[PDB]
Amino acid sequence: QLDPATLAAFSAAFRGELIWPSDADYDEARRIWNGTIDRRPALIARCTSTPDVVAAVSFARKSGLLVAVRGGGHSMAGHSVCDGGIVIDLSLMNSIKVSRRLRRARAQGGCLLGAFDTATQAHMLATPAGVVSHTGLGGMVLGGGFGWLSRKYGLSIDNLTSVEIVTADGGVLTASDTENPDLFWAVRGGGGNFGVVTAFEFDLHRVGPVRFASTYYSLDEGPQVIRAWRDHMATAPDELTWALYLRLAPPLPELPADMHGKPVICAMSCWIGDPHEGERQLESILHAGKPHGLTKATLPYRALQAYSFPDRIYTKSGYLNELSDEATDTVLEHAADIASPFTQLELLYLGGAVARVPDDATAYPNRQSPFVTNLAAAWMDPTEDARHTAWAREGYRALAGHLSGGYVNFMNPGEADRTREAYGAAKFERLQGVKAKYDPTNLFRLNQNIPPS
Template identity: 50%
Template structure:
């Protein structure tokens, strides 16, 4: 490890012997700005984030995390915690502080007999899916395979099978975590139950989770899934059909409405590439013949320009969005929950969808309900169970060129939806301030989370997140 006499920022200086002592004590690596691997390990998924930490502690186990937390606390360093590095606003990186990098912690232990899995904090969604699908099982979690399971879970966890089996946190049985004072603790329904309530939706505010224990469910290996595309000019009638169709759909069906320009992928005909399209992307678990019956009205509606909804392996469907969210592209997001798809909202969607310029800008409208809505609202810190739909508006570009314009489009779209806002999913927030975090949890849960923060992290060591201040 190249131990820096001076860190990436002139205002932060670290004692060389202390840094060397930390490096010697870690089983993993300690990387500084002079290390050849520094640029590789400081970069995160969102290319618009370009930060230079003083140190990167690449942890291989709990003792490494304890040592890194102790060093950061002692030296007053800002702490960024990295699992998959997928944080929208870039909270998994920092300037002049320490990145506690959990990505080497990849252990996955699946017990098919009990339908449970113990999962290290550095595991990515696709890695977990591969291990669980070997047994015909899955954890409800996410839609992009290079998403870190840690951050996704701690914010709630929405994905393709949540309407059948609940959020990721609804299937979380326990966590192992390191608190701000360096203590390694277990949290579950029967041990540190208050902490377990908080980590199920409260993000990384209370410590660093090093291992998750999940309940698994039978899924696949084949599901009936994929997108059906129509030209954007037909968005009003597509959305009105969609609104009525999903109102009576079974829990086995989950859908996401997507607005974008058709991507240049091998499965997309050349004459469709670049056209403004609206798609309903579906995933229907259960028997394929029953899924085909459920999906038939969607596939037969109007005049689709492309239909890719068909039986396929669950693993294939889970990776379908990967080409649209590549590492290093520039991403900006605005998000909100809405109760329903009224005609005014549909007209707004049609208008702003037709204004998309960038080939990688998109809108994802997530269908909620089902098992998510039926779970006890007070059982977890997550606060969006009554939402009808969740918007994720992406203003994206492949480089800095055009990024400002895409960001302004996303803001304008979000503002136009303001009369319909009913909340927001915390994992979809950018760096938007305390009031938006309060909105994500609601006043009562926010106050309870603040009390937990005062107990477990009174000095706000873990503040580079959707922060719940102890003050």
């Protein structure tokens, strides 16, 4: 319901694709990974260049259209699609340049992680990021970004060296340690609040074959496995990463059919370092219970990335400073109640290099909390929403006093209120000052939102 001259100026400056509610590919272009989010934008603007983004930002600003920005569409809160506004869709901006000599990568703001890992691994290089290949680099890096390499090399933001960004006034800025360093501070963990990142520059590291193990323990041996896990990681070397996924056992041939469809602890571990030393380290942590369905391999890092691991999702997540035996029994009891074969209760351990960055150095909070738990409900039948949502919420409720803060990138669509708790008073206020400078009208609000001033 738009101004004809503003539209004509927009389309005149726009070399991407416009998708209207009447167009065929409207219904698919508006779907995101969280299929509980069903929203109808006025327009989807599939940008293909930084000038495209400039045009779309300016057009939304002048039209007063609610702006959703979409990288890979993995927002657990559904932030990358809007009712009645414009989607500034970056999914066609997925170009990457990798320099081996520089050991640097430049990636457009709509890249998927798997394309970035593919390009860097052509030269045996990598930078830390999440564990699922089709996650967008856009939202993930801007919230921090952690995965297999983080204990060794830090968060994705700890390897980011500069961004190209389009601000709410239509300008293009570079942000780095030497240019607009307040903005470069804020985008390292402050989400999409401050503008559209059209390019990320990363330092890369040499990562060769990785020793990897995945196995399944019966919940019978739950208390010993989890306590071994929490105790080992308190003093584990940086090179070891080890994560627990409590879930129904998949009906896979390495597992006895007995265990199929029943709650188990799936344990995944890797050693970022010499595979022969990795074999030693993994063996010392594989035997806290009897491992079933054991898979061991020496993998290219791109294949570790591709290994992990569902239409409707709901998550509740937070950090812990410690995992007591009492919290451990809580996790095991709620895991025993898992109904869907797609649902997981994730237990992750960060720390290491993530924890050695001074807390004030970026906008990412809670570096000093090493534990992360993610109650990730996933299902197919829309008529069962209440039961699955209830499982994640009741599990979070049972763990509440052990949990603090929160990872903005695991928030769900009802968790707008958690933004203050997530960053903490000092950070939130410091960010609120960056927002008043760079987004004073809060044009970019579909995110873990930081209102200006």
